[PDB]
């Protein structure tokens, strides 16, 4: 075992030296030819009310109009964001929901939490009602994130320190992703849905091949638990938000960190991260009840989404980039433009 | 035509959501947290006779309480403990007789982490010192020797306000109130009238535990109401 530890230390030193060799210039110097975006002044265009407890998660639809939101009062509310009309109000068996997903086809929603079960609910049944299409059990820790791949496959992350890929038709674990040494807090599917990144409470992010089931790359640099993670829209990079009060943008092909979004006045962790349509803006929700829009290339804070009366727990950006939905522990979802 | 149907469905949702709002506000949520040997499961059994989380519904004086026992969750609590920021109370169960070389110090550190957590700074903690009978037997048998695990216990003296049980040895009272004051040292340090600690000398089979939780919850609600009026 001692020789294994020595070889691991040598490999870590070699990896660090290789990443150093691949890094000659910082993102600031390379982005000298791009202008700052200036102040980004979004306003609360809609306020979705009806959740009773803190909202832990939301997910936009592919139509960019219908979105599911999960509150710890035991509700998945499916919202028509245009008219603020509630389309569905699904009562959950377990009120301790920490994540929710909306199927790309729009016919299903997902949720899960402290019950360790990923519940898939149908939205377009023959009778028009909402039923529990399936329950997915097998995680030994709380379900922290879940994202649909399609009507039949779903990827989930858990405090069991592992990620799973489930076939919804049969309710079996198609694949298991293990390697993190802390609760996986969030996952982000790639644009091609072939790879996905997951940040964990071990201050590390990991890139997983969905088909192969192995950890392709491990990204370090954060000093505390990574609560949020999201792919860059181009699919060759991603961003993470951590409890060290910093966000960090990594790129997959270079294996190392590209940028750090931090400020002295920010001493609270990041709960949610989401990129805009172009990826020029990185929206991050914070514990200080605010959301910061960061110039993803210049690492400056380009705007502040203020107005939430409690911790901003969730973020979501429409597939067409029209609006940003922010959930919070004040029971309200704010639609911003 | 579609907008009218959407609005009708929304109103149908709204009435049911108002009903669910009334149901949700009528019920009090409690987080039962404790070590494996603290007797928390015995308390669960006593309350029940009278999966990633276990739910217990019990009503006292026609008031509904929903207690949640964390099971099948790793010992790294720092993330899933934030789910219980808005519960009525966290019932922290301690094995007071367990002074893991020292489980009492582990419970003290866990209580400190819960007390000083930013998301739990507004959540009251009901302290159930659950092993009073075992503590009494251990200290009476003379095998306790608490002073080696806690030197401060040597110079410590029983407080004036302590009310011993009938026929109770003074050393039993001294040790139990010493542990209670060990927890109250953390609780009083920067409590600042936003959340409160309710220490109780309990046993795993005490039928008074449910009433203690009910009374502590009533006190929490009263203090929250008084704070809303800036009276406290």
């Amino acid at each position, epitope marked *: 075992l001692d020789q294994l*530890r020595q070889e691991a230390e040598q490999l870590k030193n070699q990896i660090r030296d290789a990443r150093k060799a691949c890094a000659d210039a910082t993102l600031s110097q390379i982005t000298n030819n791009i202008d700052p975006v200036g102040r980004i002044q979004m306003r609360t265009r809609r306020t979705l009310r009806g959740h009773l407890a803190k909202i832990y998660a939301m997910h936009w639809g592919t139509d960019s109009r219908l979105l599911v939101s999960a509150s710890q009062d035991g509700k998945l509310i499916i919202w028509d964001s245009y008219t603020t009309n509630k389309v569905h109000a699904i009562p959950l068996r377990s009120s301790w929901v920490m994540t929710c997903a909306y199927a790309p086809s729009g016919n299903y929603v997902a949720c899960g939490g402290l019950d360790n079960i990923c519940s898939i609910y149908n939205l377009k049944t023959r009778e028009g009602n909402v039923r529990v299409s399936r329950e997915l059990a097998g995680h030994t820790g709380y379900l922290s994130c879940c994202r649909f791949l399609d009507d039949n496959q779903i990827v989930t992350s858990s405090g069991d320190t592992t990620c799973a890929l489930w076939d919804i038709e049969t309710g079996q674990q198609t694949t298991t992703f293990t390697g993190h040494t802390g609760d996986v807090m969030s996952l982000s599917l790639a644009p091609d849905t072939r790879l996905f990144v997951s940040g964990a409470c071990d201050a590390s992010a990991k890139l997983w091949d969905v088909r192969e089931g192995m950890c392709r790359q491990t990204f370090t640099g954060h000093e505390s638990d990574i609560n949020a993670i999201c792919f860059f829209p181009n699919g060759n990079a991603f961003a993470t938000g951590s409890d060290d009060a910093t966000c960090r943008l990594f790129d997959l092909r270079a294996d190392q960190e590209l940028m750090t979004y931090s400020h002295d006045n920010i001493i609270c962790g990041i709960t949610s991260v989401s990129f805009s349509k172009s990826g020029r803006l990185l929206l991050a929700g914070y514990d200080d009840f605010n959301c910061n829009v960061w110039d993803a290339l210049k690492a400056d804070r380009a705007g502040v989404l203020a107005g939430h009366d409690n911790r901003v727990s969730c973020l979501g950006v429409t597939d067409d980039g029209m609006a940003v939905a922010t959930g919070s522990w004040d029971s309200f979802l704010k639609i911003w433009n | 035509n579609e907008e009218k149907a959407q609005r009708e469905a929304n109103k149908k949702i709204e009435k049911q959501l108002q009903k669910d709002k009334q149901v949700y506000r009528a019920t009090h949520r409690l987080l039962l947290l404790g070590a494996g040997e603290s007797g928390k499961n015995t308390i669960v059994k006593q309350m029940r006779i009278l999966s990633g989380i276990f739910e217990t519904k019990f009503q006292v004086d026609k008031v509904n309480f929903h207690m949640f026992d964390v099971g099948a969750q790793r010992d*790294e609590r720092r993330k899933w403990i934030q789910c219980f920021n808005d519960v009525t109370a966290i019932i922290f169960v301690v094995a007071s007789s367990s002074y893991q*070389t020292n489980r009492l110090q582990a419970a003290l550190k866990l209580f400190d*982490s819960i007390w000083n957590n930013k998301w739990l700074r507004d959540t009251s903690v009901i302290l159930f010192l659950n092993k009073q009978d075992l503590l009494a037997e251990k200290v009476l048998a003379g095998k306790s020797k608490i002073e080696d695990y806690f030197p401060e216990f040597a110079r410590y003296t029983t407080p004036e306000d302590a009310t011993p049980e009938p026929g109770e040895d003074p050393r039993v009272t001294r040790a139990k109130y010493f542990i209670r004051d060990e927890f109250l040292r953390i609780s009083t340090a920067s409590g600042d009238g936003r959340h409160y600690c309710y220490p109780h000398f309990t046993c795993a089979v005490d039928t008074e535990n449910i009433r203690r939780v009910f009374n502590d919850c009533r006190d929490i609600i009263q203090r929250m109401h008084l704070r809303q009026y800036e009276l406290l």
Partner: nanobody
Framework: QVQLQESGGGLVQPGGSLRLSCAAS????????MNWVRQAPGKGLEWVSD????????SYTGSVKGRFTISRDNAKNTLYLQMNSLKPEDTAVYYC?????????????????????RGQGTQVTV
């Protein structure tokens, strides 16, 4: 990557002295409360001592009060545990643990089985 390397542990007679050192890298040392936790053979992880971000606030487990002294050097990003009046029960693996989040007064999980921000430990045999 958060790295905590412990050293200075070695054989010692009862009542002796020993200075355990902890080299910290990959994070801002002054921003995190630090801990020393041991795992004696046949026993789970035991919390011994903690020290605040600046070093003003210090706490010990009762068994080491008046014997061990925790200290931190933020400028050197290092932690120290002076060990005096040693007893055979102190023979354990000593892990230099870090509290999970900076600028916080809670220090969850440093005694957990698979805690991340914890070193590999050093052997102290009395």
């Amino acid at each position: 990557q958060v790295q905590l390397q412990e050293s200075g542990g070695g054989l010692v007679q009862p009542g002796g002295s020993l200075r355990l050192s902890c080299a910290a890298s990959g994070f801002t040392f002054s921003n995190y409360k630090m801990n020393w936790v041991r795992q004696a053979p046949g026993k789970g992880l035991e919390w011994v001592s903690d020290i605040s971000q600046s070093g003003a606030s210090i706490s010990y487990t009762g068994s080491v009060k008046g014997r061990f002294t925790i200290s931190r050097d933020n400028a050197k990003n290092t932690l120290y545990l002076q060990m005096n009046s040693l007893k055979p029960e102190d023979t354990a693996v000593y892990y230099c643990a870090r509290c999970p989040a900076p600028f916080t007064r809670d220090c969850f999980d440093v005694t957990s089985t698979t805690y991340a921000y914890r070193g590999q430990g050093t052997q102290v045999t009395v």
